[PDB]
Amino acid sequence: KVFGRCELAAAMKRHGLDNYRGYSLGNWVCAAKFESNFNTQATNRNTDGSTDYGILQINSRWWCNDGRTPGSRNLCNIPCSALLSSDITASVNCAKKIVSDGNGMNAWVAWRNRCKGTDVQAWIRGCRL
Protein backbone atom coordinates (compact mmCIF):
# COMPACT_ATOMS: atom_id res chain seq x y z
CA LYS A 1 0.00 0.00 0.00
CA VAL A 2 1.21 3.52 -0.84
CA PHE A 3 -0.22 5.83 1.86
CA GLY A 4 -1.13 9.46 1.36
CA ARG A 5 0.80 11.93 3.59
CA CYS A 6 -2.25 12.82 5.78
CA GLU A 7 -3.61 9.19 5.57
CA LEU A 8 -0.30 7.90 7.08
CA ALA A 9 -0.26 10.71 9.73
CA ALA A 10 -3.77 9.55 10.81
CA ALA A 11 -2.74 5.84 10.92
CA MET A 12 0.40 6.66 12.99
CA LYS A 13 -1.72 8.75 15.43
CA ARG A 14 -4.35 5.99 15.82
CA HIS A 15 -1.45 3.60 16.74
CA GLY A 16 -0.06 6.07 19.34
CA LEU A 17 3.14 7.18 17.53
CA ASP A 18 2.34 10.92 17.86
CA ASN A 19 4.78 12.35 20.51
CA TYR A 20 5.98 8.77 21.30
CA ARG A 21 9.36 9.17 23.14
CA GLY A 22 8.78 12.95 22.53
CA TYR A 23 8.83 12.74 18.68
CA SER A 24 5.99 14.80 17.12
CA LEU A 25 3.90 13.16 14.35
CA GLY A 26 5.74 15.27 11.64
CA ASN A 27 9.02 13.49 12.66
CA TRP A 28 7.44 10.04 12.02
CA VAL A 29 5.82 11.17 8.67
CA CYS A 30 9.14 12.74 7.51
CA ALA A 31 11.06 9.51 8.42
CA ALA A 32 8.49 7.34 6.54
CA LYS A 33 8.66 9.75 3.51
CA PHE A 34 12.49 9.34 3.07
CA GLU A 35 12.68 5.68 4.18
CA SER A 36 9.87 4.24 1.98
CA ASN A 37 8.08 7.09 0.07
CA PHE A 38 5.07 5.90 2.15
CA ASN A 39 5.14 2.42 0.48
CA THR A 40 4.47 -0.44 2.99
CA GLN A 41 6.09 -2.91 0.46
CA ALA A 42 9.47 -1.02 0.35
CA THR A 43 12.56 -3.31 0.80
CA ASN A 44 16.28 -2.44 0.54
CA ARG A 45 19.26 -4.82 0.90
CA ASN A 46 22.14 -3.52 3.09
CA THR A 47 25.80 -4.20 2.11
CA ASP A 48 26.08 -6.43 5.28
CA GLY A 49 23.36 -8.80 3.85
CA SER A 50 20.62 -7.56 6.24
CA THR A 51 17.40 -6.13 4.68
CA ASP A 52 15.24 -3.12 5.62
CA TYR A 53 11.43 -3.64 5.44
CA GLY A 54 8.31 -1.50 5.27
CA ILE A 55 7.25 2.16 5.72
CA LEU A 56 9.99 2.70 8.32
CA GLN A 57 12.66 0.41 6.70
CA ILE A 58 13.18 -1.70 9.90
CA ASN A 59 16.42 -3.77 9.66
CA SER A 60 16.62 -7.62 9.96
CA ARG A 61 20.03 -7.22 11.78
CA TRP A 62 18.22 -6.56 15.08
CA TRP A 63 14.45 -6.23 14.84
CA CYS A 64 12.75 -8.94 12.67
CA ASN A 65 13.36 -12.47 11.39
CA ASP A 66 13.82 -12.99 7.60
CA GLY A 67 15.85 -16.24 7.93
CA ARG A 68 18.73 -14.86 5.74
CA THR A 69 20.63 -12.47 8.11
CA PRO A 70 23.34 -14.58 9.83
CA GLY A 71 23.97 -13.73 13.52
CA SER A 72 20.94 -11.39 13.62
CA ARG A 73 18.32 -10.89 16.33
CA ASN A 74 14.49 -10.65 16.13
CA LEU A 75 13.87 -8.16 19.01
CA CYS A 76 10.33 -7.25 17.75
CA ASN A 77 9.40 -11.02 17.70
CA ILE A 78 8.00 -10.83 14.13
CA PRO A 79 8.71 -12.12 10.62
CA CYS A 80 10.08 -9.17 8.58
CA SER A 81 7.19 -9.88 6.11
CA ALA A 82 4.74 -8.48 8.78
CA LEU A 83 6.49 -5.11 8.19
CA LEU A 84 5.21 -5.08 4.53
CA SER A 85 1.46 -5.30 5.43
CA SER A 86 -1.11 -2.65 4.34
CA ASP A 87 -1.86 -2.55 8.15
CA ILE A 88 1.01 -0.55 9.81
CA THR A 89 0.40 -2.08 13.33
CA ALA A 90 3.55 -4.33 13.27
CA SER A 91 5.80 -1.47 11.90
CA VAL A 92 4.49 0.94 14.58
CA ASN A 93 4.88 -1.54 17.51
CA CYS A 94 8.46 -2.39 16.34
CA ALA A 95 9.36 1.34 15.74
CA LYS A 96 8.31 2.05 19.36
CA LYS A 97 10.92 -0.52 20.53
CA ILE A 98 13.59 0.88 18.13
CA VAL A 99 13.12 4.54 19.23
CA SER A 100 13.22 3.42 22.94
CA ASP A 101 16.65 1.66 22.38
CA GLY A 102 18.71 4.74 23.50
CA ASN A 103 19.48 6.89 20.35
CA GLY A 104 15.83 7.97 19.73
CA MET A 105 15.10 8.54 15.99
CA ASN A 106 18.88 8.67 15.14
CA ALA A 107 18.37 4.85 14.60
CA TRP A 108 16.82 5.96 11.26
CA VAL A 109 19.86 7.38 9.41
CA ALA A 110 17.49 9.12 6.86
CA TRP A 111 15.68 10.83 9.79
CA ARG A 112 19.03 12.13 11.10
CA ASN A 113 20.17 13.28 7.62
CA ARG A 114 16.87 14.65 6.14
CA CYS A 115 14.35 15.29 8.99
CA LYS A 116 16.27 16.15 12.20
CA GLY A 117 16.11 19.90 12.98
CA THR A 118 13.93 20.70 9.90
CA ASP A 119 10.35 22.11 9.93
CA VAL A 120 8.85 18.58 10.39
CA GLN A 121 5.36 20.06 11.21
CA ALA A 122 5.09 20.80 7.40
CA TRP A 123 4.59 16.99 6.99
CA ILE A 124 1.19 17.12 8.87
CA ARG A 125 0.20 20.68 7.68
CA GLY A 126 -3.45 20.77 6.48
CA CYS A 127 -4.17 17.20 7.78
CA ARG A 128 -7.47 16.66 9.68
CA LEU A 129 -5.97 14.92 12.80
Annotated binding site for substrate: 101
> 35, 66, 87, 119: which is the annotated catalytic residue?
35
Does 35 participate in catalysis according to the annotation?
A: yes
72 binds Na ion (CB under 5 A): yes
91 binds Na ion (CB under 5 A): no
Cα–Cα distance, 67 to 29 (Å, whole number): 29
> 52, 66, 87, 119: which is the annotated catalytic residue?
52
Cα–Cα distance, 107 to 55 (Å, whole number): 14
69 binds Na ion (CB under 5 A): yes
Does 52 participate in catalysis according to the annotation?
A: yes
Binding test (CB under 5 A) with Na ion, winner from 60, 82, 88, 91: 60
Q: Which lies closer to Na ion via its Cβ, residue 72 or residue 91?
A: 72
The residues binding Na ion (CB under 5 A) are 60, 65, 69, 72, 74
